[PDB]
């Protein structure tokens, strides 16, 4: 009808990638407070009914593999999928501990033609990262 | 047939080209707002209603504070990109 069907055994898997410490070569500083977010996020999505797992300081290959693998699982009994990325970032990309990786390459793994078990089911991505360097001054 | 890009929803903590503020002691603005709205309405509001409230909470309740007169009193507005084709409720 007008609402996604939630009548499944599981609500779905929730991947939380919490990158706090980075390699020297990247020149990125520690993201203090990101652990506070990860825990609050863990409880919230857990309470919604998600089977959440938290992966820390992931490399670009690691994040890539995590999403790819998750897209290869069987979501037949799942209502939807959710992924939360907490890291440093720049327009269109996000940081692993060893560098940057395209956000599209992470989410692409879930296109309808690449994950039949999530077809017609919502795929949610929440990203907490920068997307440029411009500052919002506000008004009045 | 179904468009391969359909049914995706992205909730960015900021609009393209800007900063996302994070407080070492309290955590980021986006996550703080997202969690408080979800832990209070996650089960009764549609996903878009929720994120809209998160948008407002982040746009209002927050305002950065730093030395450099350049990064003083700065704002933030989250961004929601939706390719959903139905309303989404996390219950029933």
């Amino acid at each position: 009808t007008y609402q996604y069907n939630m009548n499944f055994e599981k609500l779905g898997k929730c991947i939380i990638i919490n990158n706090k410490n980075f390699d020297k070569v990247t020149g990125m500083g520690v993201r203090n407070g990101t652990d506070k977010d990860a825990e609050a996020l863990f409880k919230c999505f857990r309470s919604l009914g998600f089977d959440v797992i938290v992966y820390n300081d992931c490399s670009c290959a690691k994040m890539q593999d995590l999403l790819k693998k998750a897209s290869e699982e069987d979501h037949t009994n799942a209502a939807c999928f959710a992924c939360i990325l907490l890291s440093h970032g720049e327009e269109n990309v996000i940081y692993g501990k060893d560098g940057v990786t395209p956000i599209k390459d992470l989410t692409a793994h879930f296109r309808g033609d690449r994950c039949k078990t999530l077809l017609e089911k919502p795929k949610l991505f929440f990203i907490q990262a920068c997307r440029g360097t411009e500052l919002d001054d506000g008004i009045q | 047939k179904i468009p391969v890009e359909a049914d995706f929803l992205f909730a960015y903590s900021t609009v393209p080209g800007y900063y996302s503020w994070r407080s070492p002691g309290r955590g980021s603005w986006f996550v703080q707002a997202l969690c408080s709205i979800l832990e209070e309405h996650g089960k009764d509001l549609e996903i878009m209603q929720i994120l809209t409230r998160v948008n407002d909470r982040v746009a209002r309740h927050f305002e950065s504070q730093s030395d450099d007169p350049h990064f003083h009193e700065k704002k933030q507005i989250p961004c929601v990109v939706s390719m959903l084709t139905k309303e989404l409720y996390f219950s029933q």
Binding site: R31, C130 | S13, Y19, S20, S23
Partner: peptide
């Protein structure tokens, strides 16, 4: 207050 820092940034990501």
């Amino acid at each position: 207050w820092e940034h990501x």
